[PDB]
Design an enzyme around this catalytic site. Structure first.
Site, short mmCIF file in Angstrom:
data_model
loop_
_atom_site.label_atom_id
_atom_site.label_comp_id
_atom_site.label_asym_id
_atom_site.label_seq_id
_atom_site.Cartn_x
_atom_site.Cartn_y
_atom_site.Cartn_z
N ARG A 134 -0.51 -17.11 2.02
CA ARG A 134 0.90 -16.73 2.15
C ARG A 134 1.23 -15.63 1.15
NH1 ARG A 134 3.56 -22.01 -1.13
NH2 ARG A 134 2.72 -21.38 -3.17
N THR A 136 2.21 -14.16 -2.09
CA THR A 136 2.11 -14.68 -3.45
C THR A 136 2.67 -13.71 -4.49
OG1 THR A 136 -0.06 -13.75 -4.07
CG2 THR A 136 -0.06 -15.72 -2.70
N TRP A 147 -9.08 -3.21 -3.47
CA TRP A 147 -9.15 -2.68 -2.11
C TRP A 147 -9.88 -1.33 -2.07
CZ3 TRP A 147 -9.26 -5.94 1.34
CH2 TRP A 147 -8.33 -6.98 1.48
N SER A 175 -10.71 -3.30 7.18
CA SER A 175 -9.34 -2.97 7.56
C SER A 175 -8.67 -4.13 8.31
CB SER A 175 -9.35 -1.71 8.43
OG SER A 175 -8.04 -1.34 8.81
N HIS A 178 -7.95 -6.72 5.69
CA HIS A 178 -6.83 -6.25 4.86
C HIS A 178 -5.51 -6.44 5.63
CE1 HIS A 178 -5.51 -2.72 1.99
NE2 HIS A 178 -4.78 -3.81 1.84
N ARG A 207 3.79 -2.98 6.47
CA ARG A 207 2.38 -3.21 6.23
C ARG A 207 1.54 -3.16 7.51
NH1 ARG A 207 1.58 -5.91 1.51
NH2 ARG A 207 3.15 -5.32 -0.06
N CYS A 299 -4.95 -13.68 -8.55
CA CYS A 299 -4.24 -14.65 -7.73
C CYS A 299 -5.27 -15.61 -7.13
CB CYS A 299 -3.43 -13.93 -6.64
SG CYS A 299 -3.03 -14.91 -5.16
N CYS A 302 -5.18 -16.15 -3.20
CA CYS A 302 -5.69 -14.93 -2.61
C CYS A 302 -7.21 -14.91 -2.73
CB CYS A 302 -5.14 -13.70 -3.33
SG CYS A 302 -3.34 -13.63 -3.58
C1 LIG Z 1 -9.08 -9.93 -1.29
C2 LIG Z 1 -7.62 -9.70 -1.63
C3 LIG Z 1 -6.87 -10.78 -1.07
C4 LIG Z 1 -5.46 -10.69 -1.17
N1 LIG Z 1 -4.64 -11.75 -0.68
C5 LIG Z 1 -3.21 -11.81 -0.71
C6 LIG Z 1 -2.44 -12.86 -0.24
O1 LIG Z 1 -2.94 -13.92 0.25
N2 LIG Z 1 -1.03 -12.83 -0.37
C7 LIG Z 1 -0.29 -11.82 -0.98
O2 LIG Z 1 0.96 -11.73 -1.07
N3 LIG Z 1 -1.13 -10.81 -1.40
C8 LIG Z 1 -2.50 -10.72 -1.30
N4 LIG Z 1 -3.32 -9.70 -1.72
C9 LIG Z 1 -2.63 -8.47 -1.84
C10 LIG Z 1 -2.18 -7.55 -0.75
O3 LIG Z 1 -3.40 -7.23 -0.04
C11 LIG Z 1 -1.59 -6.26 -1.26
O4 LIG Z 1 -2.57 -5.56 -2.02
C12 LIG Z 1 -0.22 -6.35 -1.90
O5 LIG Z 1 0.80 -6.98 -1.08
C13 LIG Z 1 0.34 -5.08 -2.40
O6 LIG Z 1 0.67 -4.09 -1.42
P1 LIG Z 1 0.43 -2.56 -1.59
O7 LIG Z 1 1.54 -2.22 -0.71
O8 LIG Z 1 0.33 -2.18 -3.02
O9 LIG Z 1 -1.05 -2.29 -1.04
P2 LIG Z 1 -1.76 -2.53 0.36
O10 LIG Z 1 -0.77 -2.79 1.44
O11 LIG Z 1 -2.86 -3.41 -0.11
O12 LIG Z 1 -2.33 -1.07 0.32
C14 LIG Z 1 -3.62 -0.56 -0.06
C15 LIG Z 1 -3.63 0.88 0.39
O13 LIG Z 1 -4.57 0.79 1.50
C16 LIG Z 1 -3.79 1.03 2.69
N5 LIG Z 1 -3.90 -0.10 3.57
C17 LIG Z 1 -3.10 -1.26 3.78
N6 LIG Z 1 -3.48 -2.07 4.72
C18 LIG Z 1 -4.54 -1.40 5.32
C19 LIG Z 1 -5.42 -1.70 6.38
N7 LIG Z 1 -5.36 -2.90 6.97
N8 LIG Z 1 -6.37 -0.77 6.76
C20 LIG Z 1 -6.59 0.43 6.16
N9 LIG Z 1 -5.80 0.64 5.01
C21 LIG Z 1 -4.77 -0.28 4.65
C22 LIG Z 1 -2.36 1.46 2.35
O14 LIG Z 1 -1.92 2.65 2.93
C23 LIG Z 1 -2.41 1.67 0.90
O15 LIG Z 1 -2.77 3.00 0.52
C24 LIG Z 1 -4.79 -9.53 -1.82
C25 LIG Z 1 -5.65 -8.52 -2.33
C26 LIG Z 1 -7.04 -8.58 -2.30
C27 LIG Z 1 -7.53 -7.32 -2.98
#
Ligand SMILES: Cc1cc2nc3c(=O)[nH]c(=O)nc-3n(C[C@H](O)[C@H](O)[C@H](O)COP(=O)(O)OP(=O)(O)OC[C@H]3O[C@@H](n4cnc5c(N)ncnc54)[C@H](O)[C@@H]3O)c2cc1C
Ligand SMILES: *[C@H]1CC(=O)N(CC)C1=O
Length: 374
Positions: A134, A136, A147, A175, A178, A207, A299, A302
Site C-alpha cells: 500500500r 507508505t 529505481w 517498468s 514499477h 503515476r 521501507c 516495500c
Molecule cells: C522496490 C521498491 C519498492 C517500493 N514499494 C512501495 C510501496 O509499496 N508503497 C509506496 O508508497 N512506495 C513504494 N516505493 C516507492 C515508489 O516506487 C516511488 O518511488 C515513490 O512513490 C516516489 O515517487 P516518485 O514520484 O519520486 O518516483 P517514481 O514514480 O518512482 O519515479 C521514478 C522515475 O522513473 C519514472 N517512472 C515511474 N514509474 C515508471 C514506470 N513504471 N516505468 C518507467 N518509468 C517509471 C518517472 O518518470 C520518474 O522519473 C518503492 C520503491 C522501490 C525502489
C-alpha cells in the site's frame, strides 16, 4: 486488443486467485530481517533528512505522528512468527508430500533451508494478508536512486544474438513492476482527512493514467507470469494432499491456471527462442541482483513486496527459459525442483499484477465518472 483478452481472463480468475492467495499455504513469505545493502546502512542508521520520503501530501509536519512514512511502511507485530530451518518454504515442491518422507530422515537431521542456500541470518514468516502492499509515503532520493540503479544496470554482453531483445525485455519487466507498485499505492492511499485508506484518482493519473505505456508493461508482466504458471501446471506434483489444511490447494491452483489459456502464449514473450545461453544466464543474473538491491529499501513493507515480486519475476524467467528447450522428463524435474518459496513468490506476484489490472479498470471508471460530473 490484447488488453481485452488478458483482462477477460483476469475477470474470471480474480476472485479464485484472491481466495487461494489467502490460504494458509500461500499467505506467508520467508523474509530475512537482516539487510545486506551493498551501499548505505540498511539495518540501523535509519534514513535521515527525509531522503526516503515523498513530498506528495503537502507536508507531513502538519499531519499526525502516526501517519509518517516510517509507520505507514512498518510491519504488523501480531502477524509474523520465527522461521525455523525446517520451514516448508525451503523445500522443493517434490519434498513437500514425498510419500510419507520417502526420503527417509527418521534420524540424524536434514536442514533443507541451509542446503538450498537460504542463509538468512534472521528469517521470519510474515502474514501477507496482514501486511498488504500500500501507500507508505516512501520515496525521495533513495527510492529514486534504487529505481535508477535498477534501470541503469540494463547492460548485456555486446556481440550476442538478442542483446537488444534482452535489454527490452528486462526494461519492460522492471517498468511493469514499477508501475504495479505505483498502481497499488494509488489504490491503497491514506486520506489524511478521514484516516481511511481509499483510491486516489489524481495520484493514479500522475503515476499511471497519463503514461499508457506503464499500463502496457503491467499487461506484459501479467502475460509473462501467467504463461509461466500455465507452462508448469502439467508437471506440478501432488504437493498439498498430505496436509489436512492445504489438502485442496494443489487442485485449487489448477482451477485458476486452467482458466489462463490464451493464444498470447504462442508468443515468445521473453525471447526464449532468440536469446543465447549466455544472455539467458546474464538476464537471470541481473534479476537476482535486483532481488539483492531490495535490501537497500528502508521501507519494510516495500522491501517485503519488492523481494516477493522480483523473486516472482526471476522464477518466471527461470521457468520460461528452461522449459523452452526441454523434454518431458526435464519439465517434471524443473517444476518439481521449484521451492515453495519460489511458488509463493510467483503466485503472489501474479496476484499483485491481477489486482493492478483490476485497479486500472476501477480508476478508469472513477475518471469517467468525475468527468461526467463536470
Ligand atoms: C522496490 C521498491 C519498492 C517500493 N514499494 C512501495 C510501496 O509499496 N508503497 C509506496 O508508497 N512506495 C513504494 N516505493 C516507492 C515508489 O516506487 C516511488 O518511488 C515513490 O512513490 C516516489 O515517487 P516518485 O514520484 O519520486 O518516483 P517514481 O514514480 O518512482 O519515479 C521514478 C522515475 O522513473 C519514472 N517512472 C515511474 N514509474 C515508471 C514506470 N513504471 N516505468 C518507467 N518509468 C517509471 C518517472 O518518470 C520518474 O522519473 C518503492 C520503491 C522501490 C525502489
Ligand atoms: C551498462 C554497462 C556499461 O558499461 N554502461 C556504461 C556506464 C552501462 O550503462
Amino acid at each position: 486488443g490484447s488488453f481485452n483478452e488478458l483482462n477477460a481472463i483476469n475477470e474470471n480468475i480474480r476472485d479464485d486467485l484472491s481466495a487461494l492467495l489467502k490460504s494458509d499455504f500461500f499467505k506467508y513469505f520467508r523474509l530475512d530481517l537482516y539487510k545486506q545493502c551493498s551501499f548505505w546502512d540498511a539495518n540501523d542508521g535509519l534514513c535521515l533528512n527525509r531522503a526516503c520520503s515523498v513530498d506528495v501530501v503537502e507536508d507531513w509536519d502538519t499531519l499526525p505522528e502516526y501517519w509518517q512514512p516510517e509507520i505507514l511502511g512498518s510491519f504488523n507485530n501480531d502477524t509474523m512468527k520465527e522461521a525455523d530451518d525446517s520451514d516448508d518454504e525451503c523445500k522443493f515442491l517434490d519434498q513437500l508430500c514425498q510419500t510419507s518422507k520417502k526420503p527417509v530422515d527418521i534420524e540424524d537431521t536434514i536442514n533443507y533451508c541451509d542446503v538450498n542456500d537460504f542463509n538468512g541470518k534472521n528469517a521470519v514468516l510474515i502474514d501477507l494478508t496482514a501486511n498488504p502492499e500500500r501507500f507508505t509515503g516512501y520515496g525521495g532520493k533513495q527510492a529514486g536512486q534504487i529505481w535508477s540503479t535498477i534501470y541503469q544496470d540494463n547492460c548485456f554482453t555486446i556481440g550476442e544474438t538478442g542483446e537488444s531483445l534482452a535489454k527490452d525485455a528486462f526494461y519492460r519487466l522492471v517498468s511493469g513492476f514499477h508501475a504495479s507498485i505505483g498502481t497499488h499505492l494509488s489504490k491503497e492511499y491514506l486520506n489524511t482527512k478521514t484516516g481511511k485508506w481509499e483510491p486516489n484518482l489524481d495520484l493514479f493519473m500522475a503515476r499511471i493514467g497519463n503514461f499508457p505505456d506503464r499500463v502496457t508493461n503491467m499487461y506484459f508482466n501479467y502475460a509473462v507470469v501467467a504463461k509461466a504458471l500455465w507452462k508448469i501446471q502439467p508437471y506440478l506434483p501432488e504437493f498439498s494432499f498430505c496436509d489436512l489444511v492445504n489438502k485442496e490447494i494443489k487442485n485449487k491452483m489448477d482451477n485458476v491456471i486452467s482458466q489462463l489459456d490464451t493464444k498470447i502464449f504462442n508468443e515468445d514473450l521473453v525471447f526464449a527462442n532468440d536469446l543465447s545461453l549466455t544472455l539467458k544466464d546474464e538476464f537471470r543474473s541481473r534479476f537476482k541482483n535486483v532481488t539483492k538491491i531490495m535490501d537497500c529499501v528502508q521501507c519494510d513493507r516495500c522491501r517485503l513486496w519488492g523481494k516477493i515480486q522480483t523473486t516472482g519475476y526471476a522464477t518466471a524467467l527461470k521457468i520460461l527459459f528452461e522449459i523452452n528447450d526441454a523434454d518431458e522428463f526435464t519439465k517434471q524435474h524443473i517444476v518439481g525442483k521449484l521451492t515453495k518459496y519460489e511458488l509463493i513468490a510467483l503466485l503472489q506476484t501474479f496476484g499483485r499484477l491481477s489486482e493492478s489490472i483490476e485497479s486500472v479498470n476501477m480508476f478508469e471508471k472513477m475518471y469517467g465518472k468525475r468527468l461526467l460530473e463536470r
